[PDB]
Symmetry: D3
Subunit: 240 residues, 6 copies
């Protein structure tokens, strides 16, 4: 995959697809061009039997500084663009076929929260800094940012961070439940890899069934899930 995308890099090592956001000079701000390439990246890696697990990380100091202000600014064109943001950030990614891990190396802001939580698991550096700074720019959180908070962070802490726009570090992200674990930057990569390797060792069809089933069952009552969760178990047995 060398040199194939202008704003993103993919480097696969032993089954682990590192997907690197690559606009370091713009702190990996998400522009419409990055959005369209990320869609391409996800669809491509889906059908690549070399990629058993995807690790979503950032080049340089940012994981992502959020949506690209300049590069985002005919009425209907905003339709397409907002769709393209959703398409990779979570429509493909939340229920992706393969297991996914956010490896948060640094800055994570605003619209970054959507792919952050769409990725199944997440590890950050203690040194990573997060914040929902939309309120200070005069917009509520856009896209799925607020649902991504609601799914991972308790009600009062979500509201505090959304309403104030204050930043918090990696330990605090983990305390809150936004990520699985926060570790020193120097251990970020190996901790992530150790986890990806554990996941690589499961039957991919089974893992998909388990991870999609959990995400879905939060939406459903116990009686609905009896039907739903056995349908997944049985679907897993067909396809495995």
């Amino acid at each position: 995959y060398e040199g194939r995308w202008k704003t993103v890099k993919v480097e696969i090592e032993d089954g682990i697809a590192f997907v690197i956001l690559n606009r370091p000079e713009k702190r990996n701000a998400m522009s419409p061009t990055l959005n369209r390439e990320m869609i391409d990246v996800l669809e491509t890696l889906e059908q690549d039997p070399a990629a058993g697990v995807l690790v979503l990380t950032g080049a340089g100091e940012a994981w992502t500084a959020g949506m690209d202000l300049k590069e985002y600014f005919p009425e209907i064109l905003q339709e397409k663009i907002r769709r393209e943001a959703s398409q990779w950030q979570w429509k493909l990614l939340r229920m992706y076929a393969k297991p996914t891990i956010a490896m948060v190396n640094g800055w994570c802001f605003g619209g970054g929260f959507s792919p952050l939580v769409a990725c199944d698991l997440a590890i950050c550096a203690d040194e990573a800094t997060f914040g929902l700074s939309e309120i200070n720019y005069g917009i509520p959180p856009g896209n799925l940012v607020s649902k991504a908070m609601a799914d991972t962070v308790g009600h009062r802490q979500s509201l505090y961070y959304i309403m104030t726009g204050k930043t918090f570090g990696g330990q605090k992200a983990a305390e809150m439940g936004l990520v699985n674990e926060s570790v020193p930057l120097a251990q970020l990569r190996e901790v992530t890899i150790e986890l990806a390797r554990n996941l690589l060792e499961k039957n991919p069809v089974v893992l998909r069934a388990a991870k999609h089933g959990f995400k879905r069952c939060r939406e459903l009552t116990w009686e609905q899930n009896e039907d739903y969760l056995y349908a997944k178990l049985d679907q897993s047995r067909l396809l495995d």
Copy 2:
């Protein structure tokens, strides 16, 4: 001035911050039909008053609130006309959470002391909450011979883990403010001496934001909890565009 305006509630505005003080301290701020009707009045008035940028909900004396008024809200009412009971229940809701949970302006519970039973609805209806270490909390309904009434259980469901919520509802054991913070019921517990100033600093942060934007953000978050991600794509973009208009 709102001086002398209500019998059971005082409003004191400082610098954009409207301190709403439940004011039945000889009855530990027990929530009676008079208080419930005046609190409706209060929220509607403050809503339309540009001098109030943030509402801080707090109590006079030792209590924040000791709960619904056992005399005036329950015992005096329960043997009278059914249709009045239903009206009284509804008036309690109207201010505890119907106007308050999606209130136009940002809201903070400042819990100075006792907080029992029906006080959990407005507690959680307020966007944010700081309590005092010295504050005692309890869901004492079970020990009084009723399940939690109104939205008390949903207030718990929204902010506290399932195990912890069931434990406190079922046993009716009390817990103090550091425990309230740890469980997620409030944002922060601080010693009483430091309560007002900690609350004041959060309120000034909130007063710096564009109110309309702050309203879209807080309202959108509370509602997105109820919706799937696909529903939220629609809904949350609608709230951002609605916000842009306004």
Copy 3:
């Protein structure tokens, strides 16, 4: 006397507390179709027994339950008619959560040791839970080649945060009792040596409440998680007024 009544389970009552003991410790209390059927009978029976006011679900020997019986419940059922698989799954759900999640009487899981896989459904169905620090937990399903079956994933979703739930479900890693309390899976982890004492203490607090009021409280909480605030205004007052009747 419930003595000798069932092959795979025991019931011991003790001053209002009915200890329901999963009893196949040679097989680490693996849940076979026979245990499932007998547990249905247990639960229906004790529902109507006034001598039993709180149920404590525990295991004989070293395990709470090692999960579904790999042989009796999986291997042997796959070799029978398809239509029987249907009956078998239904019978598992019947006792694990269908009767048990909204059971009439308060329930506590007293998790003395191993709890795996299918064990998580009755675990979270039970209202409250105390485990031994020494107890080991595991969603080993992934490592056996299946996603969690029955209501196991829902069990986690209700009690354990999103990231933590996926971590354990996706990796199949085990964790001990203190980490289970920390995650919100149980109420409390204590040494094994103290487990029964602490549980009885909880059960006795529960026996003090009015049973019908307690029912209403614990049922209304579990259902209110499912409903918006406006739906719950209706629902939760109907629970309160149903409780006053009964």
Copy 4:
């Protein structure tokens, strides 16, 4: 002469609530909204009032919405809702829209908030909103969703085309369309029938139904037995 914009009459337990802005085809102003809240709240505590029939004065039932800093809008939107459906949908007492003529736009919400509806064949309905450049506002679109099938709802919303009392009965929008010369008599037979019911039980029944549509079967086993037990208490 209690209200400016609304007349009320109570005969043999039937409270006719009459929208009374005839000159304006009963278009719903902020003043009427505020007064309608007063009306509903007043009539609820009235021991003589058993059923409420909601109609318009002269020829319209209502022509819909009658068309201060930003935040005042919050208040005007809330007051509309408060009488149209927040109090009205789950009203303590049984409720009948007696739709005598014109029924456009925002009048769809109290229309459907009322338990039952009898219209006159000669009545015209419309979701004109579109033609004026706005999508249906308040709860108009949900009211259609509740009562009129998917295809027809979208049809009348998207086109703004109008329809008679016969086509409204047929679509599920109302219970019956009958001639305007019989509208009142038909409505009153229904109302009398409803008055003979135990009011608390009727309330448990009608509220029960409306909620149960949002709930699953299992959720409803809990819930509808709670309304029933609730009824045994309050009755």
Copy 5:
């Protein structure tokens, strides 16, 4: 099956299991006895391969005239409060917990009266054919209670909003043609052709792979409760499950 239940009769007929509510002296009123027997009947038939389709009908002039007012209360007051939990659960158990997502396809053959508590099993049955001569009514209100158990939900699923509210609120009676026109039943036909029409339908159902039929009908009933996005996941899970189990 012969003479095995005091209040129900089962007649298996070359794949079609006719299940007959059998208290015609009492208009097939559903007592606690009948509730308990109907649970046994539904569990027994599920596992009997001679039953491919269940047809639920009543002996006599009635389908069922609702809950048995006399023996519900007779049994309930001979006992404490908790006895009502058990009795209500047993009613729900056969009327719809087992019946609504039943493994085998089901048809209500409604030959006469169908009142109150009867609507739950009627709607739990996948499909329904009635006699023009059959009379339906929700008379709970005239008896001074709201519809109990799943009756109002049974209505909400099959009959439009105004019409359900009208019949629940008034307790007014309606006939077979009306019931089919309201969407309560699939079809209404003269009582003389009731058995003919039902059996044609049951035999059509017999043509299909049982597991595939179960997947289709269960998945349709669940899907009403779910969004499109949710159904994308759910409905392909049922399809794949069917392919695994269809044999």
Copy 6:
């Protein structure tokens, strides 16, 4: 759009874009190739000022006879995703109004794009059926939900369970489509409705139709919030 797509055709005439399913030799059966091209079609038409309303129709006798009856397991995920992508994920909440003009055979997987389209007119002469059950599959993709949304409970279950076909007039009486007209009069009746819609402000039309489909999922209280937001979003995008 002359000869741009292999299995589909586009013909705009004065605001109306006719999207024509174009495998009449296979009764317009939906192959993976068709699914990919339909995505591309729906995206392209979304950004074209020329198309104001889309009309979804079939070349030859069929509207569509349903899915066209592999490799690594993963390939299925993609093919299932691309089926849904045009049938309803793009189509159900499409920016521009959509009408299904059902000229003939409508089977199985064809009910998903049928119900996703906002409005529908079929020919009396058209035949529908949910033939899945007969081939030993329950209905796939969003077929059962498409029924659940437009057709009553007893009827949906009837047609799903029996696999019996029904004509255009029965389709309209069930609620599957808006209206059934003779075939001879399908293009005319449809164009006239298409034209009524073209007279609406597009952004206002999108708010109203998306808001209606979504409000079916929400309580009254959720809808007060959601419908007033949609209205205010409308007034901005203008």
